[PDB]
Structure 1
Amino acid sequence: ARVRNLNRIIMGKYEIEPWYFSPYPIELTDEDFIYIDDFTLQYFGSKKQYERYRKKCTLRHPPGNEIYRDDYVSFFEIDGRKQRTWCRNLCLLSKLFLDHKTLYYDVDPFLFYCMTRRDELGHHLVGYFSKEKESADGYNVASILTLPQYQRMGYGKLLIEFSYELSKKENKVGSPEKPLSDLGLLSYRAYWSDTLITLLVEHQKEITIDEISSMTSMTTTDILHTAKTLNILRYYKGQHIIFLNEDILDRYNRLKAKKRRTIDPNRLIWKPP
């Protein structure tokens, strides 16, 4: 009698191996897989069951409002209490790639921003980030995930950038909830670095902290830590600023050569609470 652990999930054409344990309310059996519908995120212990439900009429994108949509990606705003089942299913899936996450069942306190790539085949959920409706610490991101099959493609950077666009529209500075996983922190540092580097070449050669905070919603702390790592912290005309140098132009051109996608602030049609 084999009592196996969840060693792989079937999502679309991908067979994915979990990084961490997730509290799926499933029976332990001699099999080590479950099916995860790439639309409803619902889980099944048998291909047959998955099949039965695949046939039923359902939307082909996240159950939320599409508040951002460009030729590359779309962002859907989902309210936990308004879509408990779907969101609980999203947290269960997310917990497979996070060392720690709050009780997946309690989704009412969060707002979920899900990102999709649109193909001739429709919407494909590639990542998302959650956010506390009310955060005592002003965190603008609770948990953030790029589905593993789509990692290392720039989507995570898009997710972080979008989270900052909400904060800008909200007229508040924000920072991701601490502590961060090594993966998340390295993604954030790359993002903070690319942002200051782009601001210094496309906006102004010298920028004060307030100006950077105003244009990016980044916190003083994250701005200063980033400016120090790049060695661009200086004092000019009475206040601390970040300045442009040769290394920056170089890094910028390299970044640009990578021809990456970004978030167009003008395409965010959204009003904060």
Structure 2
Amino acid sequence: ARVRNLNRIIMGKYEIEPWYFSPYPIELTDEDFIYIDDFTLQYFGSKKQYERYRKKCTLRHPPGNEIYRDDYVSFFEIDGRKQRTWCRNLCLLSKLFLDHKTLYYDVDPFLFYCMTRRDELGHHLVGYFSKEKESADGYNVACILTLPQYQRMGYGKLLIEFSYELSKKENKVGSPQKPLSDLGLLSYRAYWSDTLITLLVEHQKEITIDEISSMTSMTTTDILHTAKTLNILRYYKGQHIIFLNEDILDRYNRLKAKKRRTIDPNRLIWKPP
């Protein structure tokens, strides 16, 4: 009698192996897989069951308001309390790739911003980031995740950039919840670096900390840490600034050479509560 662990999830054409254990309320059997509907995120122990529900009539995108939509991606804002089932399913899926995550069942305190890529086939959920409706620490992100099958395609940086656009619209600085996984922290460091580098080349050769946080919603701490890492911190005109140098120009051009997609602030149709 085999009592197997969940060793693989079948999502669309993808067969993904979890990185960590997730509390799916499922029976342990001699099989080690479950089906995850790429639209509803519902889990099924049998292909037949999955098929049975797949036929049902359902929207083909996350259950929320589309507050951002460009030719590349869309962002849906979902209130956990309004979509408990879907969000709980999202959290169970997310935990498979997180060392730790708050109780998956309690989604009420969060707002989920799910990003989809649109094809000739429609919407495809590629990642998301949750956010406390009320954060005592002012965290502008709780967990952020790019589904495994879509990682290392630039989606994570888009998720992060979007979280800062919300903060900017809110007229507040923000920073991701600590502690961050290594993957998460390294992604933020790259984003913060790319951001200061782009500002120095496209905005001004010299910029004060205040100006930076005002334009990016990045906190003083994240700005200083990033500036020190790049060796671009100085004192000019009576205050601390970051400055441009050949290294930064080089980095900027290399960044641009990758012709990466970015978020257009003008397409964010959203008002904070």
Q: TM-score, normalised by structure 1?
A: 1.00
| 3-state secondary structure, aligned to 1:114 | strand
Q: Deviations over 1:191-237 (max 9, x none)?
A: 00000000000000000000000000000000000000000000000
2: CA distance between counterparts of 1:119 and 1:198? Answer: 29
Structure 1 residue 175: deviation in Å?
Answer: 0.1
Q: Cα offset for 1:123?
A: 0.2
* Cα distance in structure 2, aligned partners of 1:9 and 1:165: 33
SS of the counterpart of 2:235?
Answer: strand
Q: Give the fraction of aligned pairs with identical amino acids, expressed as a percent.
A: 99
Distance 1:226 1:120 in 2: 39
Q: d(CA) in 2 for partners of 1:64 and 1:210?
A: 34
- 1:254 CA displacement: 0.2
Deviation at 1:81, TM superposition (A): 0.3
1:75-120, Cα deviation, whole Å (9 max, x unpaired): 0000000000000000000000000000000000000000000011
Q: Which residue of 1 aligns with 2:193?
A: 193
- Separation in structure 2 between the aligned mates of residue 258 and residue 51 of structure 1, nearest angstrom: 40
Cα deviation digits, residues 143-186 of structure 1 (max 9, x gap): 00000000000000000000000000000000000000000000
| Aligned residue number for residue 77 of structure 2 | 77
Cα shift readout 1:48-72 (whole Å, capped 9, x = no counterpart): 0000000000000000000000000
Deviation readout 1:121-153 (Å, 9 max, x if unpaired): 000000000000000000000000000000000
Q: TM-score, normalised by structure 2?
A: 1.00
The CA distance in 2 between the partners of 1:254 and 1:4, in whole Å, is 47
- Report the alpha carbon displacement of residue 46 of structure 1 after superposing the two structures with TM: 0.0
Structure 2 residue matching 1:160: 3-state secondary structure: helix
> What SS does the aligned partner of 1:97 have?
coil
1:177-216 map, 5 Å: 177-216=177-216
Work out the CA distance in 2 between the residues paired with 1:23 and 1:241.
Answer: 47
Question: Paired residues, what number?
Answer: 273
Shift of 1:2: 0.1
Stretches of 4+ aligned residues off by more than 4 angstroms? none
Distance of 1:121 and 1:200 partners within structure 2: 39
**Equivalent in the alignment of 2:105:** 105
Partner of 2:22: 22
Inter-partner Cα distance in structure 2 for 1:160 and 1:60? 24
C-alpha separation in 1, matches of 2:26 and 2:41: 15
Aligned equivalents of 2:36, 2:195: Cα separation in 1: 36
Specify every segment of 5 or more residues in structure 2 that has no aligned partner in the other structure, as ranges: none
CA distance in 2, matches of 1:213, 1:147: 30
CA distance in 1, matches of 2:46, 2:119: 28
- For 1:269 and 1:80, locate their aligned partners in 2 and report how far apart those are by CA, in whole Å: 20
**Structure 1: where are the runs of 5+ without partners?**
none
1:8 shift after superposition: 0.1
The whole-number CA distance in structure 1 between the counterparts of 2:28 and 2:244 is 58
